Amino acid sequence: QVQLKESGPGLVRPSETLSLTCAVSGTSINSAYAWGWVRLPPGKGLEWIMTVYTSTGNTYSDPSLKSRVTISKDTSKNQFSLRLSSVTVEDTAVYFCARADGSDSGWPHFDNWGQGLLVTVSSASTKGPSVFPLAPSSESTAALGCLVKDYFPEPVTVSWNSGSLTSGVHTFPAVLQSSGLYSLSSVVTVPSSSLGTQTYVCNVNHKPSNTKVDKRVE
Amino acid sequence: EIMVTQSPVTLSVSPGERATLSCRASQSVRNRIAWYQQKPGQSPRLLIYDASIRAPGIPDRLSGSGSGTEFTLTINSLEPSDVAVYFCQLEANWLTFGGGTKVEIKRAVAAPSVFIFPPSEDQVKSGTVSVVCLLNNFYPREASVKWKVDGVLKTGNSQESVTEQDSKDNTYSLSSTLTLSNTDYQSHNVYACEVTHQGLSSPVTKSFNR
């Protein structure tokens, strides 16, 4: 009965200030016990950042980043924002905002999380991907795919036949190449007898670069 | 100063059996532990708060317990919908989560289907070609992929990626990409992908010319 939605830039230059806004829908923000920010670094679990309490406005933050983080609250917009300053590349993570509940004990726990927003910290520029088809060499099952090469930053969306084909599809997580750019594959297994009577297209979407490409695979 | 350590890192449980996850606090914290479930690409969902209280909507199969320093999350009759990462959280003003525990179901040994994809013709115009080898639907999580160009081993020039455990058949897929320059790709002939896996009696090799 409460929905949270993170907002902010997906790419931030180093040493700048990351500003993320958490829009709350369903209830008043001050009707909640407390609100918090938690991020998910690559190769790391959940790491709590800040927590603001409604009745007092008091803030608690992780000591390893105390002077670099603040939180503002706008009751008119029914939202609260997180501001991280002097941002380094260590701050690249998926940032969530969540509602806290103290139960009878008064100790906080999160009961409602937002979608989460990926923020990459890099001085690199936004780059669109190159999409190449993946077909076997020129046997009861064929493997078709698309290679989404050299894009920045994450993420990208890949669907097959405009979401009409889901079975046998495997979209692999992206791999960070040593060039600073990402590349992933998205494969699908189909009956070999259907290759002549069935078209297979991959729908690649890279919102950071405003790129959209559909590739016919044969 | 209080730390919460989870154990084990990965947990492999047969379908219908019991999964027992551990969360150890460095100091006695009574019942101030909350458990969360997080699936890949999704937000964390609250399972247990105050050590043993189920969140609304959480089935009776899952139940938390423990007081003091050691805490346990139990998943009885494990379901394919239970494959996720589970976090325990210390309920304090200075919050802190555990490292997380990945849970997967146990399956019969499944051999992988090995496919290899020659680079498209528009790749060579770019100056860089990428050949992809696909390992599709195998249960033993780890395999060994080897790239051989004219018999020369070239594994350190590739990158691999593994998808999550499938919700339907409970297998894993792997995709390796060997990235070379066009001026180096045109100077060699045979490009082979050698796969070693538990479900294979001998290594499987897929190759192509040109």
Author numbering:
A (entry chain H): 1 to 35, 35A, 36 to 52, 52A, 53 to 82, 82A, 82B, 82C, ...
B (entry chain L): 1 to 210
Extract from the study:
In the present study, we isolated and compared four nAbs from three rhesus macaques that were immunized with a group M consensus envelope called CON-S. Although, the macaques were immunized with different CON-S envelope vaccine regimens, the CON-S nAbs had immunogenetic commonalities, and were able to exchange immunoglobulin chains with each other and still maintain envelope reactivity. To investigate whether the antibody sequence similarity between DH840.1, and DH846.1 translated to similar variable fragment (Fv) conformation, we determined the crystal structures of unliganded DH840.1 and DH846.1 antigen binding fragments (Fabs) at resolutions of 2.7 Å and 2.8 Å, respectively. All four monoclonal antibodies neutralized CON-S, but lacked heterologous tier 1 or 2 neutralization. Overall, all four antibodies bound to Env gp120 where C3, V3, and fifth variable (V5) regions converged.
